[model samples]
Target: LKTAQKTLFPLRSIDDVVRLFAAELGREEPDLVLLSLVLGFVEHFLAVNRVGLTYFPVADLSIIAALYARFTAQIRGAVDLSLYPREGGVSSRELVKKVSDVIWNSLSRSYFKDRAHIQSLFSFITGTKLDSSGVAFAVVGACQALGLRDVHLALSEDHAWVVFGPNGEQTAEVTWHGRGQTVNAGVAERSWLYLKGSYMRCDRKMEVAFMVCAINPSIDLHTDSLELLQLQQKLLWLLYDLGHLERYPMALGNLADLEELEPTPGRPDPLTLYHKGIASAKTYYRDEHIYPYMYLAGYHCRNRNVREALQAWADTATVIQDYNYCREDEEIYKEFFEVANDVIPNLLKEAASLLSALQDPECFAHLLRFYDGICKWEEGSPTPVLHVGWATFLVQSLGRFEGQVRQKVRITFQSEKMKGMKELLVATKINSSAIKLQLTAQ
Candidate 1:
């Protein structure tokens, strides 16, 4: 993982680099030229860094070309190149030199090309006097020269990524920034990218990054295993940003071959396990897992599976109580029973009466079990302040029921345990809509 972290080189000034490249390309204002240049720079950067390169057999070349074409088509419309356009009519020579210098300097340590390779590659690909096309080809050509396979390209809202298999079986992702932040860590952006990268190279036997170095390595831009590892680390962060456990499972699957290579573990990392669980659940959901009318239930609940969520909550409750039980005591147990007998039954009666009026058996059953669970837990120990708070709120909100509902409310007040319940109920009723929504919805 440390090695992976080393590979994803940090951007010193991505904005400055982009600006320099754009200016060199004579894109004084935002326009298609600037967009194309940015995209080209991204491609060139990955290629020069030796991030995704494999020897493409002739047959594979066709596939690679097609993939590139598709990729271009996918992003062409969305990228706003016109946001910056050329301002004073600039000569092609000045633009070419500017582009060449910026790219050369950025990749100076990694790409050992003299000005010739840069000039030739650019001209060969784009057939333009300004050597713009050559820059794009240099990127693609360098990957081919490095013998990287299954190199595919993908673009997001503000960047592009070069994806391939490193170790030939997993996905490796390298991102390019065209605008905005290079990576959004909130979603575990790097890991997600790595996951996506590995997926792209699933058919390969081994896939690995050519460069691995600290994202902010002490050395200038260069290729090494350390650099590759750093890239992987960045990809890991990308996955975090995605925040879906579902993706974690897929990532784990791709890394199966390298499972033995995983670092030692002590206490389990919840984020890692979450991804694994989500992946497993996804598989099960597709296979044997069945909940009749699940989709319909979700639809009725505004796309939330009320029953599923409830069951999940119930499972969490059980786990929590079990954990609590491990640290149980007699005094706590006595107070728990006091609260259960004194408070829960009255709460349930009120709940049932309210549900009966609404004629909602589903809600009634849900509340019944909810109250029952609380009472059961309380019997063994004093109720936690949080649980007490919830119970108190429930009793007060139930008091709002008119007519027959009021009778049920009155039954709750009849209990000796219900003495302080009125004060708690009154306070709760003053700000009750939230409690009402939970009661009705759950």
Candidate 2:
């Protein structure tokens, strides 16, 4: 029997984590699983301790080491090297599939996949549970353990997969199955959300940043642990200073979210952080990601900066205009829904005239742009985005604006395709007579 290994070093402080990451990143191939487990365990330990689970030591580093050992052993012992052909070059299809299979088959059949504490090797070893992205991380870690250096994690805003072989040109979907879907074939067709050509191809250290960025410190809906949040914030800053978060726009938004909750004395303000995230996505991901704009919009909304909020939401719509709505897009769909049904309605209710919103032609233009983007998103999608409720919202929102303000707004269509969008076109087309009738009726 193989002897189990234990780690004596305890992660007792934020500095300890920094030191751990600094040391591990110095290595050519840092142990991804171990680093992930350490943060997971620490956050879990802190949260549980808050609710009277104090018997467990502070991040018993042994638990992390044991999980790491099991992961390494599981991949090595279960993966049959002889089955793989000793081909001239590393294709990595069979190897990545086998590793992914090892992770996937072992996952708990039906638990809450989105539950906290499930993204680490600690959860995988003890309970065989991992979120979708977590499984992708594990597969990459397993490949690293097997001495496959070319394999790397590719991430979108919400999903993950691996890209390996021949200058990292090969791609595979190691998670999420649809009926009769093949892994690499889906990657080739760009059929999956994570396959959206513009994704972050993470290196080993950048992979570490992903793991760090995945940390969640929420204790409940309305509260979170300060210690855990601070730890996550510091680690993100560590990654940021190392230039690891340049292309990872969501991670920058995560850091910005935390900074907004509690300002750090010497760091950039939340607005600057949010803007940096936007610029990062614009420069790196071709501005395809939406959450950076969402984050900025949310910040503006919270601060009651109505004009800025409208502009941010319009920018968000501009990004989503490129994506076709699908089942996997529910999260973003709900985000837009909340903004439309709740946030914008509440804003207008409070300030139709208080903010002179009814008189500002620019504000009117932004609202139209926002609605137009959603209409464009629905145009090519199999899903129907607008319904009676959305129409009611538009009618009521338009009613709140003055007929003069509506007339001041100019509708521009740059393409014939854009000109055919019915909702926006109707809204603009009937503007003159519609305003005259409403004015006479009033």
Candidate 3:
């Protein structure tokens, strides 16, 4: 009875798991019969969790499952299993260990039988070359089964886990907290634990120690989108974990790339809208619709076109009313005005100085054309209001310069603020006895 029982019970339980894997893989139901027995043998040696088998997607998992399923089906066809069920009950742990060992043994044989194909599959999925170190292969196999292709392998001085992908790639890595002095280089090797595919045992303190490594080297890290971007970003995060920012400037630099290009373009750039949104967040920051205009001004400023920046800012101010003073309001308009008043004047003054130094008639003519463009924008307005506050700021700021610089500057600064300031300052500063003032007295 004991002999008959040993033959039947344990074998049937192992067969159940193999059949389930084959069914999940979409293999024929009959094929699962043979696969079951083969899995029973393999599981007996591996000592891995049965839950691990459920981690992979059905199709990918099916590859291994079908093989074992076929093996069992063939064995069952030729063998007489009629007396096996009479075996006594086995302990769960012992049964699990037995199954694992059997499965692992089969895997060892298969690895030698088709080493090239298995190694290639492992490499493609893990982004690492195969070696005699069974750890990498085992971990990669677990990862493939679990559908985790984009994890980074990292190590520092402590423990390890996986880091997800970076900014623009599809891999993750491990992290390192700075510690200790006389550490061994092999200590760094501990970081390779992520490559070992044994993350389930990682301690909570060492959880964030890994870095992503599966990024496709062919892709440009700076230009990729969010989903594609995570892999590289995760890698950078890991480098940051090691306090290696100086060594990883490209990683940080790529973030700037995202900042420059991530926004969606509308009629105006969405970044402009975003800045405006920020400004709008403040209370008493009038000019709710001024972002596009401010953006245009800043855009021109970067191009060294002060006149255009002035004109655009002026146009923007005209359309949006300045917010009335409110203690609760953050007074964002004051900040905008400060930038408009302080920074822009210096810019215009610099442009005028540069033009005067050139002393080129052709350049001056070009300057005049730019001046005309500003005038055209002002004249094109349905309302004749000169965006007086903005225009006055520019004119008075330009008034501080000398000669042709002053003249070209004043022409562009034409607004109510300039007129009032000119009346007060002109009497005292202007050498009225020497040169006639061309500006109309207010």
Candidate 4:
């Protein structure tokens, strides 16, 4: 495959590269299918590197073309794509948060932040060095990077992944889903959408930018060794705890409850730390595990235990002040301030929101009567205040009676503060409705 490469494919444009390896395979006109996949791959390749390449080195381009050709060779019998109804695809915004942080923390390393060292990423990913027992082939990096499997699962896309019985974990045979692109997208079709981001190849070439778009997938191609599968299962557990799945992928089954039920002694577990709250405060700490505390706060808040929820968040503040949180990792330090700013405020705003549903004024008095203390009018005023034991509330209690017309409306807000407090207000000519509102204010 290499001897004739000197003259075989002199790559130029994405089209030129596409034309060179449009093999006769996959579709009715398999050449076009290969070309479509190539176009999509190059589009993704260029989009990830928005800075653009200075020059198109035939040598460099051909190296990429070879990888494409190698990828093209697997076109046949590799994928069995078709439409199918799928359900219970877990929403993993929580899971995405965790994975994103894992990726962010890895890249923010001082080694990658430097530009001089980063230029090395432009070098091509030729699949010669992947160390797994499984045979590796350079692949276009789209579906894998974006976690599109989850997306397609959510959409119940035609080619919904089936990870179960017999051919269950056989993801290799079912790569390439063009969900947003088309319903008819086949093994090789134009993919207008792709997951966009850089991947630090499993090969550990940090200096490489978007190298994740190419050689990275080839290396990620497979994992079947028992040890490899265990890590995969561990990741599945992490994802599961963060979200849920209607059914396990046909191949890799879902995590068993007992695996995480019993902690492995000193090993830190997120769920365990979350369970004990501050009592087990120092126990379940992972330096990178900061956000899990906030996640647990949300979890406990939903479980309707405000005391436990606040306790979880208090633990989050504790984690921020941990001695292990050195001054060195600037990113984590910045996030600490952000956690304080974002979490507590958002929680307060949401908690305040749950207090009461503002109701129809004329009808609301019916419920207020049960607490007759509010039934009697205040001295000179005719309308009574309906207090539900809150700091403040808007009451269209009375309209100023002027002769036959109560032209001016009155809105009374009583306070629970000793030292006067102003609750809320702003600009508006809009009256409360077809009738009353407004009055005493100093």
Candidate 5:
């Protein structure tokens, strides 16, 4: 719009989205953060296979600089400041050490074969084949395109891994499924490339769209106790298919008040007691069927209990059509089983419309399935006092239908009764996969 509101006029922080994406692509600032990590891996390959960049492909790693140009200046001497990002610029650790030496020495010339129980790393996009979660989501999108922040994407059971640095105590089998995980940087996810080539795969589940690619969120690596000193999104939530990545999305306690690092561990893992500001309704895990129906549909839509949160979203859409194999024909080839099987039959037909949505928010499809079933049960709960009482009941549930909640792309009308409001945008893309372009609009 007029060259982004006339030169992003008077914009403030949040790295003005990587400084107006390096001044509207004149490039460099580490190749516009490697073009925002190749547009956040085509926005998570357009949210897991809803597809748009025309049949997907990014592969040139230049065969990954002949296996990581001698660990490119050695992951710049173990950098960490969570690999740098608070919107300040220029430390993509030499394009994150040649993007972790072209995704860990192109898995030493990838090409593997082993079925039942996993042994992967072979799909240069999709020809060499063996794609255990597309080589651990292109090595966690090259460690979120070098703004590392304590890398994670660790999901257990069906495997897909990587957990790198700052005392989650390192990992990055990329994908093989002895059980996979997350994060990767340095020579790099910490200039510490000690890859064991492949063998971290399996299943179990939860939300956090990023159960990541097959290699997923676990139960007891001694309890999925969330922690973080870094892992800020810096405006990167990759294209759509709403969640799952070799088990990504688990940073509960953040320590980025600018001055903080190596100070995270106070979760459900091995440490406890009143733990001030507590709301963690502890579900650690009991294996599979989609993280206890997305943690009991966010504690049954924060006790408004819309038909027990649509029976925990119809048991999280029948355990994601049996772990996202969903088909008309093979998908999960780095995911979006035909757009999560058409957005899990519309999140189970809008759960008979969140069944009573705060005494039914006068239908905008019951206020967009009750504000997308309470923000998909508060983005799979880590509970900051139930997202501070459901973020104060989504600003008092839109003043109980004083309306207001517009959008343009896939048309989401509301407002009118929305009267005196100043900027109230609660559009979690109408419950993601951009609600299949808002159900093909109309």
Candidate 6:
């Protein structure tokens, strides 16, 4: 008996599209542009081009292929053929630069740079637009178009770049990061923004994970596409099971976020997923990532787990201690800001009625350690991390504890350098007994 061959095209449902994605990823060489376009189309096509459609849009492979052809043609046209490397070799910096330039200069320039729908090939091909990471992804797509297999996308938490040449040692900035982004070819190689050279290098399969990871299910601020969310969850689970996400902390966190929203029965719990995310960062990226801890802390706070939340916040602070506060790091700074000025304070308010939680010496100890970690972070950074706002937060939050409870927190600087600074700031809080911090030198 002859077996039937199913075609993965003109998908009618979310599952059809995800099936195609899985099939593509299963191959030794999956097409990045194709995956990005199809995923982008499913998530964005209905929202942006919803003129006549009332129902959710379907993924049309033929239409996507035509769009992919257009993008390939544009890239091939701009890149000089003679400059390509010889067979069985990596792309050169000059060639990577040319590929990057074509994507960078072709953008439509005037649209909102931070808007959605700009992170995939569908937007880039149809509108000649892309955001920062989108440009980096497009450059990788262009390299794939010219058969330069060595060129791959390298990503940090907040930015993207291209890595080519032998052993993926060469780095080139193809997109802007913040304040409108990049002319650096390895200029960011040593910068803390790039995690001091500790970034994820996406191989072909990992690139598929990136595409899956980038899937945006939000239709608006309040409403999300149910189908898209399920599709992303399923795809991420597939990637996780295949061991693709073993080294990808952020991707794991993405999956964990989805799971926390609506968990699948057979898979691990959201807490488990979050731990995997933190563990992956610790093992692979030296725990340089901050979001994993933030995600975990947020989860614990939301669930009324006060002790765990404080510990997670402290862990987040420890990660920041390893990084210098730079302009590009404002995203994380805001994360810590929210944690300090909002999350922890609100968490304490909710748990205030539980006298045990409020009076636990360990909890008080954790609060001081959290603040101490931030202080340490500021000491290591050129940019100041704490200000009057942070002081206000400390005073208000510390007022919640009784003198007896506050006394339980034995903060010892262990160094004279920190002791003076600690005493000055602690004493300056209204110079009042209620908010005064007591510290002893260890």
Scored by lDDT, model 2 comes in at 0.74
**Residue ranges of candidate 6 with Cα displaced over 4 Å:** 1-6, 50-56, 179-192, 353-355, 410-418, 421-442
lDDT string, candidate 3, 348-407, tens digits: 567666653233333332333332333332332332322445555534553444444333
Q: Which candidate has the top score in lDDT? A: 6
Candidate 4 lDDT, 194-231, residue by residue in tens = 10100011211110111211222111234212322233
lDDT of model 3 at residue 341? 59
lDDT minimum window of 10 residues, candidate 2: 433-442
Q: Write the per-residue lDDT of candidate 6 for residues 1-442, one digit (tens) a residue.
A: 0011036777787777767777777777787877787877777755454432335576565677787778888888898879565554877777888888888789996999999767888888888889888888899988998889889989988889888878887788788877113325223433346776667888988888887887776677886667678888999988898899998888888998899999899889999999999999889987777778988988888788888989899888767665567667788788888988998788777777655567776776677767776666666555777766776677667656666665535665432334555443333233433233322211
Model 4 whole-model lDDT (C-alpha atoms) = 0.28
Q: Judged by lDDT against the true structure, how good is candidate 5?
A: 0.32
What TM-score, computed on C-alpha atoms, does each candidate reach?
A: 0.23, 0.87, 0.25, 0.24, 0.23, 0.89
- Give me the candidate number with maximum TM-score: 6
Q: List CA RMSD, all candidates.
A: 22.6, 4.9, 24.0, 23.7, 21.9, 4.3
Ranking by lDDT: 6, 2, 3, 5, 1, 4
Model 1 poorest 10 in a row by lDDT:
205-214
In model 4, which regions exceed 4 Å deviation?
Answer: 1-43, 46-288, 294-312, 356-442
Query: Could you tell me the TM-score of candidate 4?
Result: 0.24
Deviating ranges (above 4 Å) for candidate 5: 1-99, 102-250, 253-298, 301-304, 307-442
| Candidate 4 Cα deviation (angstroms), residue 224 | 31
For 199-311, candidate 1 gives per-residue lDDT tens digits of: 22111111111110001222234532333233333333333333322323333322221222243244234334433533443453321111111221222233233434333
Error of 4 at 153 (Å): 32
Better of 4 and 6 by lDDT: 6
Ranking by TM-score: 6, 2, 3, 4, 5, 1
Question: Tens-digit lDDT track for model 5 on 1-442?
Answer: 1244235433233344334433433321122222323333333332322321233233243432322332222333333445445343332333334444455554535445343112112223223333465555555544543445445444432345555554435554545432322333211211101111222221111222332122211223443211100112322222111221212212121111101223334323211211110122122321232333444454445445554554554444333322212111122211222212333234334444554343333322333333342333323223211223223333433333323323321212222211112123345332322332322221
